[PDB]
Each structure stands twice: as C-alpha cells, then as structure tokens.
Amino acid sequence: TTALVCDNGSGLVKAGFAGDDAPRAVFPSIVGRPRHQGVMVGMGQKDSYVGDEAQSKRGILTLKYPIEHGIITNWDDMEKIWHHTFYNELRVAPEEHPTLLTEAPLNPKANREKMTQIMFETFNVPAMYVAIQAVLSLYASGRTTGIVLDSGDGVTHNVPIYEGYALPHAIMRLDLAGRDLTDYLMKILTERGYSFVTTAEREIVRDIKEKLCYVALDFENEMATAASSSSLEKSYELPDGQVITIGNERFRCPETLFQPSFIGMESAGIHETTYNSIMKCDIDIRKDLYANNVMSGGTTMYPGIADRMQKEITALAPSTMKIKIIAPPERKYSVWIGGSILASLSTFQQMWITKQEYDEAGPSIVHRKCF
C-alpha cells in the first residue's frame, strides 16, 4: 500500500505518493470566487475555483488564502483544498491509502483536533500522521541533528533538534515570510509608478518575486551600485503585454528578512533569531548546530541567501567553531522528500494512527503520540 505525502503549506500544497523523489501535484492554495455577474448561461460556471483553475482564471476572481500565518483560518476553503488535492489531482480514494500530513511548530491544540477530525471523519483514511515540517526538512538532509530554519509563506520559524529530540523552548517563530515580502514589493513598486492593488495582481507580484528577486550579499554596496549605474535593472513582461523594469527592488524585497524595520517590526532579522535559538540550547550541543544550519521553504530560493546567511552567522556568533550552511537545491520540496522517506519505513508501521485508536481516544491521540 502506497502512502501519500501531502504538505499543506501556507503557500503551495505539495502532494504525491510516498517512496518517490518529486511531488506530483504542486499547486498554490487559493480559493477563487467570481466577484462579477454571470450572463453566459450554461458551460459549467462553478462558483468557487480551487487550485490551478483559480490561478489560470484569476482575472475575474477574488482569491482567498485558507492559510494565514501558518494557522488554518478558513476551514471550508481548506476542506475544498483537501477535496481538490485528493480527488482531482491524485485521483485516489482516501480509504485505501495512508496520508502523511505536516504542521507548523507551536500550533494550537484545537487546530490539531480539527485537522485530525477532518482527516478521520470526512476524508476517511486507514492511517495518518502529523509531523513537524522542520523535522521532515532535516530528514530530507539525512542527518539526525541540526537546526532547521523554515521560511514559508507566512511563518519563518527556527527549530533546533538534537538526536531527534526537538527542544520545545528553543523553538521560536517570526511572522515574516513570502506574503509579507510580496506586500512590501507592492508598496515599493508604486515608487516607480506601477500600481497593484487587486488580489489577482498578488500572483503577478509573487511571480516577479519568484523570478527576479535575490538576496544581496551586502546591502550598502548594492545600494551604491544601483544608485551609481543602471546595470542591475531587469525587465519583466506582464500578461497584458506591458513591460516593467525594476532596479533596487530585486534586493530591497528580501532585505526585510534581515531587516524587519522596513515593514515596521521591532524584532531583529532571521540571523539574530537563529542566534537566540542557539543560545537557548545547551552549550555542549551548539557545535553540532552551528555546522548543520539547514534551510527549507521556497523563501530560501533567492540565490544569494546562503553566503549572506553564513556571513551574518559567522559575524554574530563567536568564531571558535565551524559555521556551515546546508542549502540543498531541492530544499523547496524537502518537507515532501522527508515525508516520503519517513512514510516508506518498516518501523513506521507501528507509529501510524489507526481508525481504532481514533475510536478509542477521540481526535486527541495525536497530542500524546506525536511530539
């Protein structure tokens, strides 16, 4: 029996069969509803577009994200996301396949109760599992200890873990990720005269954030280079045929990850949050954590984040012990890859959460079973 690995992330849902290397169904988690009126009678004008059909038809749709800051806010939309990713994408019956699921750290307990009761009562499964995203991200890297920083679409959280023992007090969470960078990119693009206010335009600004933005190695030198010469200006073609050109906004947009005072937050950057996560650990295991900094999440796809992150950690920490950044090229799907590794083990058959365990202990055995 092939298990299913379905990371229901804030940005993009990544689902597929276990024991494979790449997820088959990667699609953004949006529910599109038509704000306008219908005049053309017939031809399947269905009232709530979910997934890639909401992406393709986005010019007439209000898009709602069911996940906000790693918290499942809208539940009917999120059930529609699960129904689409089981029936339309994978095209598999849920009652004949185990379904591995992922979760953010420091989640509310009743949130876990609600996802457990939807995954046992509406979409009946033989078994399911809830795992921490950072732990599966570490398991994709193949090492047992290390610190995983994961920057999704709403949450950038740091989890250090030593020999599989996830330290609860040293986990923390910063609400600054890809959607906030997208909103700041909307705010700074109006300086050049380009206005983007609709939720349809959020996909366009997210697309230019995906394609053109990059982490600067030094912010001041890149400021001086952009102010001096127009060599770094890059063009983009909009879907209506217009061509825009952006300059310093290619690096002013990820710099919020290192300087949260741009969008007006008192907290420091992700390097300082990583450092304060390391000082919360015991002093003996810090040497393992400094050489095993693992990135995950698509917000680390900017192609300057590793060297700048190594520079910031090596500058902030004492230089006694080794600083090494683990940035695999497939770390965007490292949650799914680690879930596929964990689901396909002979020892994992006794950590499954069966239907009989659900009938015995309510939707609450996931608290006492999982971490």
Partner 1 sequence: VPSHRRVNPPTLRMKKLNWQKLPSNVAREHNSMWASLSSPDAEAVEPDFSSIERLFSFPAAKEPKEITFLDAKKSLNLNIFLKQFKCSNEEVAAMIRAGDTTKFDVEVLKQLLKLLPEKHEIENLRAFTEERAKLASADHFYLLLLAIPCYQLRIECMLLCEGAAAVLDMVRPKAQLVLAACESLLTSRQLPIFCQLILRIGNFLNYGSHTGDADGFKISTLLKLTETKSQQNRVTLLHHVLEEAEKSHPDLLQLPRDLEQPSQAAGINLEIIRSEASSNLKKLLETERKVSASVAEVQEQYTERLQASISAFRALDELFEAIEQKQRELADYLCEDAQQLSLEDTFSTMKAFRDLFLRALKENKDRKEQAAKAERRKQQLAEE
User: 96, 137, 166: which is closest to 14 by C-alpha?
Assistant: 137
DSSP state of 24: S
Picked from partner 1, Mg ion, ligand ADP, none, the partner binding residue 178 (CB below 5 to 8 A depending on kind) is ligand ADP
Is residue 195 helix, strand or coil? coil
When CB distances are held under 5 to 8 angstroms depending on the partner's kind, the choice from Mg ion, its own copies, ligand ADP, none that residue 248 binds is none
Minimal distance in Å, beta carbon 231 to Mg ion?
32
Residue 36 vs 91, nearer CB to its own copies: 36
Residues 77-106 that bind ligand ATP (CB under 6 A): 104
- The whole-angstrom separation of Cα 193 and Cα 188 is 9
The 10 Å CB-count burial string (b at 16+, else e) for 115-142 is bbebbbeebebbbbbbbbbbbbbbbbbe
Among 143, 261, 315, 321, binds its own copies (CB under 8 A): 261
Q: Which of residues 143-162 bind Mg ion (CB under 5 A)?
A: 152
| Residues facing 234 on adjacent strands | 246
Interface region with ligand ATP, contact rule CB under 6 A, candidates 112-120, 136-144, 296-304, 341-349? 296-304
Smallest separation, CB 189 to its own copies (Å) = 13
User: Which stretches does DSSP call E strand in the chain?
Assistant: 4-8, 12-17, 25-28, 31-34, 49-50, 61-64, 67-68, 71-72, 99-103, 127-132, 146-151, 156-162, 165-166, 172-174, 234-237, 243-246, 293-296, 325-326, 353-354
CB of 315 to its own copies, least distance (A): 22
Which range in 113-121, 176-184, 271-279, 316-324 contacts ligand ATP by CB under 6 A?
176-184
Q: How far apart are CA 38 and CA 46, in angstroms?
A: 11
Residues near partner 1 (CB under 8 A) are 76, 79, 95, 113-114, 117, 121-122, 124, 139, 141-146, 164, 288, 291-292, 318-320, 322, 341-342, 345-348, 350, 355, 358-359, 362-364
Q: In a 3-state reduction of DSSP, which class is residue 152?
A: coil
What does the radius of gyration of the chain's CA atoms come to, in whole angstroms? Answer: 22
By a kind-dependent CB cut-off of 5 to 8 A, residue 345 interacts, out of partner 1, Mg ion, its own copies, none, with partner 1
- Applying CB under 8 A, the residues found at the interface with its own copies are 35-36, 62, 106, 169, 187, 195, 261, 264, 266
- Applying CB under 6 A, the residues found at the interface with ligand ADP are 9-12, 152-153, 178, 206, 209-210, 297-299, 301-302, 332
